[PDB]
Symmetry: D2
Subunit: 248 residues, 4 copies
C-alpha cells in the first residue's frame, strides 16, 4: 500500500471531486498531503475529509495566480516538513464561451489558472526537487486538451499547452530523476456533471465506449500510480483516463 | 496556377524567412496578400518584396498584441477588399531560457505573442469568415509544440496551445465551412540557423531523417496547399513539415 | 499545373472512387500513371477514364497479393518508361465483422490486402527509387487506423500498421531523399444512415474523392519534399491530432 | 498487496525479461498466472521462477501462431479455474532487415507473431470475458510502434497495428466492461540489450534504460480493478524517449 511513505505532496484544487480523491489517495499511500482550496471553507473541508478518512493531511488556502502565496507555500512546506516530493496541479477553472463572443478576460482567466499557474508552481517546486534529484509533478489536464470541444477554445488551448509544457520540462530536467506527466480525465462524475440535466449527461455517455462517467477515484488511482517510485521510468506522457472517449 | 484568385489573405509576421515565403507564395497563386511586420521598415520591405517578384501585395505595420490595431486591420481590409478569406498566423518570437531561470516576462511574452495573439486575430477574422460561410486559418507553429525542446518550455507550451486551440475552434466553426489547421515547421534554414557554427547546425541535421534543414519555401507550399479551395475537407489538423524529425 | 511533369506513377486500386480521382489528378499534373485493378474490366475502365479526361495514362491488372506480379509490374514499368517516381498504395478492401464473430480469412484478407501488399509494393518500388535517390510513396489509409471503429478491428489494425511502417520506412530511407507518407480519408462519398455519419463530422458533409486526390497530389509533388513519415488527415474534423 | 486476488491471468512470452517480470508481478498481487513459452524448456523455467518466488503460477507451452492450441489454452484455463480475467500479450519476435532487402518470411514472421497472434489470443479470451462482463487485455507493444525505427519496418507495422486493433476493440467491447490497452516499452535492459549502450541512452531524457519491472508495474496497474476507466490507450514507459 505505502509506496509514498514519508513523501510530502502538494495537491492544488483539492477541495472537491477529483482533487479531493487525489489528496485522499496520496495520503492513503503514506504521503503527507497539503491540499489547497481558494477559500477557508475549502481548506477546512480538505482537513475534515482527511480526518473523516482517518488519515493525516492538511488543507490550505491558495490562489494559484498569486506568486507570493505559491512561493510562500513552497517555503512553509519545506520548513515544516523538510521536503517537497510530489506536486499535483489540479487547480483549474473553465470560462466557456464561443470563440466569436469570448472576452479577453475569459481567455486570460483560463490561461492564467490552467497554464501559467501550472508553470509557476512547477518552476517553484522544481528548485528543491532538482537539488534533491527526486520528484513528481502530475498535471491534471483534460481530454479537451487532446480532442477540443466547442465553447472551450480557451480551456483546449490551456490544457494542450500544459501537455506541451510537460514534454519540454521532462526534456529539460533530464537525468535529474524527476518525472513530469499529465493525467487527462474525460467526463468524470462530479458536482459539475451531477447538476447538469439527464439529457446532457446521456449525451456525454454516448461519447464513451465504457458507457459510464468515470469517478474521481479513477483519476486518483492514475495519479497515485504515476506518483509512485514504481512509475519512475514514465515521463513526458499523458495518461488518458476517459473510458475510451479519446484514444492515442 | 491561380487557385487563390480573388482571395484576400493576411499573413502576420511576413517580414523574413518563412512568413515572407508564405506571403510571396500566396501572392503567386492569385491572392491579394497583406503581410504584416512589427515596424515600418518591415512593412515597406514586404511591399518591396512583392513589387520585386512582379506581384500585387501589401506590407503593413502591426503589433499582434494590440487589439485595437488587430481590429483595425480587419476593418480596413474589409473596407478595401470586401472579403477576408485566409489568415496565416506567423507572428511569433522565442524567449529561450531554462524553465528554472525563465523570468515571468519571458514566459508572458512568448504566451501573449504566440498564443493569445493567435486567439485574438483568429477571433477577429471569424466575423467576416462566419458571415461569408468560408475561410482559412492556418497557424504556423513548430515541431517544438509536439516534441518539446530544452530551453523552450514557454515556446512548447504556446505552440502546443495553438494546436489545442485549433482543434477546438475547428469543432466550433466547422459547420460554417471555415477550416483551421496548423503547419508545424521542423528545423528551417533561416537567419537564426545560418547564424550557428557548422558543429551546431550538423547537430540539428542528425535529428532529421532527410539529413537537411528545410526551407521557407517548404512551409510556404504547405500553407498554400491548406489555404487552397482544394483542401476544404482538411480541418483541425497539424501538417508536419520537419523532414521526419517528428512523426505522428 | 505541371508539378509532376515526366514523372512515372503507379496507383494501385485505381478503378473507382478515391483511386480513380487520384490517378486522374496525378495525370493532370503531368505524371504518366499506371492504375491497377484486380480485373480486366477494372483495367479497361482505368484506361477509359484517362481518355475521357484527355489524359495520358494506363490501366493494368494486378493482384497485389501475388509477389511475382508485383515485382513484374515494377520491372515492366521500368522497361517501358525507364523510371518509377511515385507509388500510391490505394489497393485495399474491407471485410467488416465484429471481432467476436470474425473468421481468420476475414482478418487475413484485410491484412494481406491493406498491409502486406503495401510492404510488397513499397519494397518493390524501393529498388529503382533507392537507385534514383528520389521518389514518393503515398499510402492511403483511413481515419479508422487512428480512431478505431467497431466492426473494423482488422481494418484498423491494417491501416494503423501501414502508418507505423511508413514512419519506420521514412526514417530508414530518408537519407536517400524518398518521402513516405499517409493520407487518411475520413468518410468519403463514393458508391438517416448518412445523417449519423455527418453528426461525427465538424464540416457537416462527407468528403469527396477529389479531396483525397488533391492531398495525395500535394504530397507527391517536389514541393512536398520535406514532408515525410506523416499522416495527412482528410476527414472533415472527425479526428484531430 | 492483493489487487488481483483470485483473478486468473495468461501472460504470453513469460520466460525471460519483460514477460517474466510481468508474470511474477501479477502473481505477487494475488493472480493465478499461466505464463507461456514456445518450448517446454521455457515452460519449466516459468514454473521454476514462480517456485523461486514462493508463488502460485505455472508455465504452459504455446505456439501463439497455432489456432487450435490458442483456443485450447483458453478452454483448459476455464476448465480448471472457471474464469479468465486477464490476458497479457507479450509473446513477440523481431526479424530486423532493411525493408528493400526484407524477405517475405521475415515480414510474415513478425506480423504473424506480433499482430495476428495478438488478434487470435484476444478474440479467444473475449468469449469468457464478455460472459463475465469484465476483463483486461494488455498488449505489450513498443515505442517502435509510435516513432518507427530503421531495420524494423515489419516490427513497427506489427506494433502500430496492435495499437490500432486495441482502439477498434476497445470501441467494440467497451460496453461489456472489458478494457484493452497497450503498454509500450522504450529501451529496456534485458539479455537482448545487455558505446552501444551509451548511444541508446542519449535518446532517453531520464538517462538510463528501463527495467522489466518498469513494464511489469505498468501492466499490473492497467490490470487492476482500479484502472477500469482506462481503455484504448497506450501507456508509454520509455523514459521520455517518445512523448505523446
Amino acid at each position: 500500500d505505502k509506496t509514498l511513505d514519508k513523501q510530502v505532496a502538494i495537491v492544488t484544487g483539492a477541495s472537491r471531486g477529483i482533487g479531493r480523491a487525489i489528496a485522499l489517495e496520496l495520503a492513503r499511500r503514506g504521503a503527507m498531503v497539503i491540499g489547497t482550496a481558494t477559500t477557508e471553507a475549502g481548506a477546512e473541508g480538505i482537513g475534515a475529509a482527511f480526518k473523516q478518512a482517518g488519515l493525516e493531511g492538511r488543507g490550505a488556502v491558495l490562489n494559484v495566480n498569486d506568486a507570493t502565496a505559491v512561493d510562500a507555500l513552497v517555503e512553509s512546506t519545506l520548513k515544516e516538513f523538510g521536503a517537497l516530493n510530489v506536486l499535483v496541479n489540479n487547480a483549474g477553472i473553465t470560462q466557456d464561451q464561443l470563440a466569436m463572443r469570448m472576452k479577453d478576460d475569459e481567455w486570460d482567466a483560463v490561461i492564467d489558472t490552467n497554464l501559467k499557474a501550472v508553470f509557476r508552481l512547477s518552476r517553484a517546486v522544481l528548485r528543491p526537487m532538482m537539488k534533491a534529484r527526486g520528484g513528481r509533478i502530475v498535471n491534471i489536464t483534460s481530454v479537451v486538451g487532446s480532442a477540443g470541444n466547442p465553447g472551450q477554445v480557451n480551456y483546449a488551448a490551456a490544457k494542450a499547452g500544459v501537455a506541451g509544457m510537460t514534454r519540454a520540462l521532462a526534456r529539460e530536467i533530464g537525468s535529474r530523476g524527476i518525472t513530469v506527466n499529465c493525467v487527462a480525465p474525460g467526463f468524470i462524475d462530479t458536482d459539475m456533471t451531477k447538476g447538469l440535466p439527464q439529457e446532457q449527461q446521456t449525451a456525454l455517455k454516448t461519447q464513451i465506449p465504457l458507457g459510464r462517467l468515470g469517478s474521481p477515484e479513477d483519476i486518483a488511482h492514475a495519479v497515485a500510480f504515476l506518483a509512485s517510485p514504481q512509475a519512475g521510468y514514465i515521463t513526458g506522457t499523458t495518461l488518458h483516463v476517459n473510458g475510451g472517449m479519446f484514444m492515442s
